[PDB]
Amino acid sequence: AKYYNEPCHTFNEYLLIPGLSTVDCIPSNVNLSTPLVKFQKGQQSEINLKIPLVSAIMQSVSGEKMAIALAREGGISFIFGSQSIESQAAMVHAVKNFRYLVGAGINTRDFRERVPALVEAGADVLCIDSSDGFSEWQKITIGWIREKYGDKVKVGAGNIVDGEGFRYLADAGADFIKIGIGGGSICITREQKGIGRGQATAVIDVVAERNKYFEETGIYIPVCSDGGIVYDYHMTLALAMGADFIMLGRYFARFEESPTRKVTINGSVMKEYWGEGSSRARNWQRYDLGGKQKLSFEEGVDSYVPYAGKLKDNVEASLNKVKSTMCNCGALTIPQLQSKAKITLVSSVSIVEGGAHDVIVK
Amino acid sequence: AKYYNEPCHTFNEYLLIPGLSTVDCIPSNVNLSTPLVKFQKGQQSEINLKIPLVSAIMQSVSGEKMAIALAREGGISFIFGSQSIESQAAMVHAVKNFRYLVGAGINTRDFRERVPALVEAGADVLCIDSSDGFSEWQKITIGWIREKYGDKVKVGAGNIVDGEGFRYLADAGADFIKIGIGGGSICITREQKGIGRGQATAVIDVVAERNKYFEETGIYIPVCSDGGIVYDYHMTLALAMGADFIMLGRYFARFEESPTRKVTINGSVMKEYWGEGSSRARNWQRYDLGGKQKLSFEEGVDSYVPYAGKLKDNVEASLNKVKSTMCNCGALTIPQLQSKAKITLVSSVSIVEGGAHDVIVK
Amino acid sequence: AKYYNEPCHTFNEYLLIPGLSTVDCIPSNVNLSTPLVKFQKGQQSEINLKIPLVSAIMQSVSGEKMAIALAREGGISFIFGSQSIESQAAMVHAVKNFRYLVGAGINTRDFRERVPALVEAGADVLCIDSSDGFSEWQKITIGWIREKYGDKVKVGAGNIVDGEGFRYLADAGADFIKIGIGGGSICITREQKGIGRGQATAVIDVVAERNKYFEETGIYIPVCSDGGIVYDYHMTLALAMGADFIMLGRYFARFEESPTRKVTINGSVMKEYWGEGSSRARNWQRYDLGGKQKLSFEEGVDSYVPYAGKLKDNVEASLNKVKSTMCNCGALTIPQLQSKAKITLVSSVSIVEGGAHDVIVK
Amino acid sequence: AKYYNEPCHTFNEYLLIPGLSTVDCIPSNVNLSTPLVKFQKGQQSEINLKIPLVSAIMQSVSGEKMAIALAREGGISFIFGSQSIESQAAMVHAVKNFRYLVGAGINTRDFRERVPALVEAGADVLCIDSSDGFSEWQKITIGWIREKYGDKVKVGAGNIVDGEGFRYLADAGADFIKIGIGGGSICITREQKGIGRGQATAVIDVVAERNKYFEETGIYIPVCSDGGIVYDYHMTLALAMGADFIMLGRYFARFEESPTRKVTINGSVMKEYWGEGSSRARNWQRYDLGGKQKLSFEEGVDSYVPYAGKLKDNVEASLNKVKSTMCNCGALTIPQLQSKAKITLVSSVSIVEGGAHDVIVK
Ligand SMILES: NC(=O)c1[nH+]cn([C@@H]2O[C@H](COP(=O)([O-])[O-])[C@@H](O)[C@H]2O)c1[O-]
Ligand SMILES: NC(=O)c1[nH+]cn([C@@H]2O[C@H](COP(=O)([O-])[O-])[C@@H](O)[C@H]2O)c1[O-]
Ligand SMILES: NC(=O)c1[nH+]cn([C@@H]2O[C@H](COP(=O)([O-])[O-])[C@@H](O)[C@H]2O)c1[O-]
Ligand SMILES: NC(=O)c1[nH+]cn([C@@H]2O[C@H](COP(=O)([O-])[O-])[C@@H](O)[C@H]2O)c1[O-]
Ligand SMILES: [K+]
Ligand SMILES: [K+]
Ligand SMILES: [K+]
Ligand SMILES: [K+]
Ligand SMILES: [K+]
Ligand SMILES: [K+]
Ligand SMILES: [K+]
Ligand SMILES: [K+]
Fold this sequence. Notes:
Keywords: Transition state analogue, IMP dehydrogenase, Mizoribine 5'-monophosphate, distal flap, general base, drug selectivity, oxidoreductase
Number of domains of chain A: 1
Chains A, B, C, D: Inosine-5'-monophosphate dehydrogenase
Largest sheet of chain A: 8 strands, parallel, barrel
Strand content of chain A: 15-25%
CATH superfamily of chain A: Aldolase class I
CATH topology of chain A: TIM Barrel
CATH architecture of chain A: Alpha-Beta Barrel
PDB class: oxidoreductase
Assembly: tetrameric
Entry title: The crystal structure of the complex between IMP dehydrogenase catalytic domain and a transition state analogue MZP
Helix content of chain A: 25-40%
Oligomer: homotetramer
Bound molecules: the ligand NC(=O)c1[nH+]cn([C@@H]2O[C@H](COP(=O)([O-])[O-])[C@@H](O)[C@H]2O)c1[O-], potassium ion
Shape of chain A: globular
Structural class of chain A: alpha/beta
């Protein structure tokens, strides 16, 4: 077996150490644009978001209302694929003809039928939805798409957590690669199967490989930090570590625009939020290992998250914090932040010092 | 004194990082066979289990019903030796003539009488039951067996936690070596005597020495990770780290087939489970240091574990998780897993991220 | 991005290992004098405090009564600047003509008007109040002061946490540099923006750079450990690590002399204490990044701290502990302590051993 | 200031890894004898205990009854010195003429009068009682004793935690050196003054220096691990790390023979136990830094410990565990253990695995 020199870590263990802020480092001057799909050195991506936030490929998150609301704010939603091809295509079509950008998730089994339907519906980009994307199944799926559409259809892939996985999907032809296994708020894969890696360590490792790949091939492949975002500053950390954009489930599930019902639990207004690996969703394709067309066991839970209001207001508040921090770090663009960021791990005692302490908060 | 560069760790601190899964990496294609006794390079062990699980040499675990039920599923039980030679021989005989495989535990004191009786009863393999097997007492016991039976009788030995201990028992002639001191769920040896080592670190260290020994002698000695298995994924980790099979007490004590009584504690159906070092068992031979034929002090406790039902159903569920994970890692056999596994330590904060978080589980 | 070899740590994780105590190492012989502003090698600072304690630039801490009481004991207060120029100047004037030393906080926006008013009022030293002082805004402010007053006006600056930040402000001309981001008892910046560093690590790193700067230029720049002091021994640690003086908010807010109201909360007499970044204070200048003249979001909280009595009695008790420890370390002056101190990190288990344990405290 | 490469650790973080146990490694063959005072290479100490346990120099521990009971079992008590010279001398005299060995604590102030009185009373050995023994005060005290009695009077000294402190007291002429600052169960020095070091790290460091000193001078100076012993296995660890004997307070305070009252607290029979640094004891000499003859502030607490019965029965039970472990490690004497011991640090997760887990203890 192979071992590592250091244990993996995640977001709550890090802090950014401010660099020089020039007079032009004003939050209003910060440009949050970011590339969504791979491109050649010196050029621009064919698809650039205005903000680095994308909603998860989940039944309880990316519906028509979410896609429209997020697209309006500059991001993009990936309409969930854990539904019939016909219904998913209809959702994509409704968003495209509500021009707002919209993505759609696909699986490694019915892609020969689902892809044509989604392309026809007007999807701008696709993304294979898999817990563990380091597989020949994803290579086959991407290969078929390239075979039939060449570079006309953009397809994201994976969910790998190290350089090897990234390299495999990059060579396979993925337009962007998703990072993360087990970090999701409603995910229990790490406790059920024992696979995964701290989200931050995964991003840092994959980004290092992505940059080597870029120097070697001249091809820049955007990577997405998927799952584990709890606080707004976690967004800034993920971007600083090298992620081009961030995929979130819980963050968006709390909004009015999520397709779930609002429910009151103990005097608190909540919203339903469940994992694709829960018996409720039954998205067996996401965990498919060539076995029976059913969920062998649960890898996600059914839950409630606090209702946070409208997406627009929340996204605005979150990004204002991101932009402010970027200015503390002397960055006016995401690439600048990724270059200038000074990132340190924090001891548990330092964490205690970071919050309010030795006072009774009024 | 001698010190080490790193502290010891155990199962809960590790995770497997998935490798490439090929289209043939289907759970149904996974072969869980594993060698039980030492063999020569290029050859097969004289005894191979169909599944890598064996039940502990304990009064509250390995009785006749357990031995039959586990043998039926592909594993093997080691009938406890903390009972009269006559009664233990009778249990072995009943299992053999219920052909199901069955093992039997022996001690370093009455082996001249117990061994012949067990061989006569039809035991397929024996195993010295000792907390600390790094001793001349075990070497003497193994030597006597070899003297009287040559290689016809198979005897496991030890419970060592480092390369030195393994080497000693290997040279002594043990057919397989058991790893672990203090990791047992009902064991308090580490708190009473201050001896022991994290189970994972022990397995990793012993396996390293076992592989060097193999290259040096051409003799492959199977090793057993004994104790400390709490979750099903711990089984996968132990195997990935190099263990050929796993010995469990608590895991099996919870089943209908364990020889203990079912008792209701606070509306919950439980089963009795006690350590061999508890006053209830009085297995002083297991902790014998050439002193009086009595337990100097307790090193185990008397307890209750949740009733889990039938062994067959539980073992099936556990191994389905093991096989699934092996497929994520690209392995269809245990040796493949041990070769391909990528194993990382996990920070405490990463552990929190691994479970459900920031949601109210419904 | 840039990463570090070790995670940051803070006060609770350290202990001093006693050195040789000579017969002259008596608490009564300890000299707690310390320089407040930069000076040339071989010379003395133009301003030396008798004790290394200064009160925070906060509405809930440094008012007229506090400034007089602390000055009387040998320290100095920095009258808060989060108020009109006229009212702040009046406070400074009242203290100066109550001669007691007194400081005053300024911001990077209205300094052209505030500075003249404060100098006119008789302020002995000024200090830019900023969460993140690594900025051109501070350089511009210091430059203007030097332009108009040369070296006649002393101005402290910053709140940096590493060598780079220190170097920038030193070259900018600051008379003393303040260390610390996010360690304040009422501060939640690290949780809102994700920026900061463990206070101890920050002091140690900045001090190392300060000493290199001294050897290079012959100019000694005093540094201040600002925020995070919870226990009296934390003061000793900060000084031993290299800090010349310590800035405290919570510590002083608990005293009779703080400008806040005493309130009873659950039978306990408390005092109000709030952060400059709370909606109550609205000190937006402290977090200004060239944006709108308002607080974008809260970075501090409103709270209550236990009433501790008169400043004189408390400061006497605190410093008696500091002097005693200095004697255990064989130091009769702060520079001696900084030279002789032996400082070690402490494991969490060692921390448990440090307090009373395994006994019921009567 | 000076820093260290690793943080300090203490007893609960360590475990012994068993070595080879020969047939002669029987608990009954273990010799627990140990030297109390320094001697020349190749020779024997003038005072050897039969067991490596000594009672603390405390009012609530070492009275006449304790001294007699412990001496009977092979150890020695150091009659507390925080009382009049006359009364302490009377206690020593009573023990000597009850021949049982007995020690007596002295301080760095009234030694010119206390020492003669104690020698006259028949004390076999003396020991300076100080929290921080790295001082000229101890050197002066030892020097006076040597001046007046030469090598006829044996005097222990210190309480240092590193090689430097040991070296100083060794050169000063101490017959044995005590290790430890802040580890005491009733001690809060580390929380009041911020000085100290993990007990295990202190012992390990001092022992290393002691062994170098021995090679350099041919003089073997016994060292004592003082404070922090919570479990019986902690005794084994301290000895394995190099300590010749162990000083305990809490351990003995629980016995019938301790001079304190038995009190019932919540249906549990307890015994009073307080630190010498508590207002109850007022042992200001122990924390004397040449200041006023009074306790500047408390460094110890007043408490209750569980009543454990008679010393004889408890000491027998404790040492049976020590002897058993020594046999697991292949040692029949303390020097053998110190040579053969294999000591590892243990992760927090490994600690959890070490106790009973995942079972309901009946
Ligand atoms: N285990 C599951 O059932 C599951 N369902 C969805 N997800 C993952 O968790 C991410 C959302 O994480 P989060 O933003 O809620 O923390 C999704 O984008 C997807 O990668 C899951 O891990
Ligand atoms: N301390 C004891 O009394 C004791 N009794 C049995 N055992 C050990 O603990 C193992 C079972 O551990 P576990 O599967 O319950 O965690 C047994 O195989 C044996 O090695 C014990 O450590
Ligand atoms: N976040 C806030 O609102 C805030 N207000 C004041 N402070 C900082 O916290 C310090 C006082 O910290 P403390 O002594 O209360 O721990 C001040 O000197 C200042 O640097 C703050 O961080
Ligand atoms: N702080 C105190 O008041 C105090 N009083 C006694 N002691 C120390 O603590 C030791 C006893 O520790 P323990 O065996 O109770 O853990 C004594 O031998 C002495 O070195 C103290 O630290
Ligand atoms: K900055
Ligand atoms: K804070
Ligand atoms: K895989
Ligand atoms: K999770
Ligand atoms: K000292
Ligand atoms: K303590
Ligand atoms: K042994
Ligand atoms: K255990």
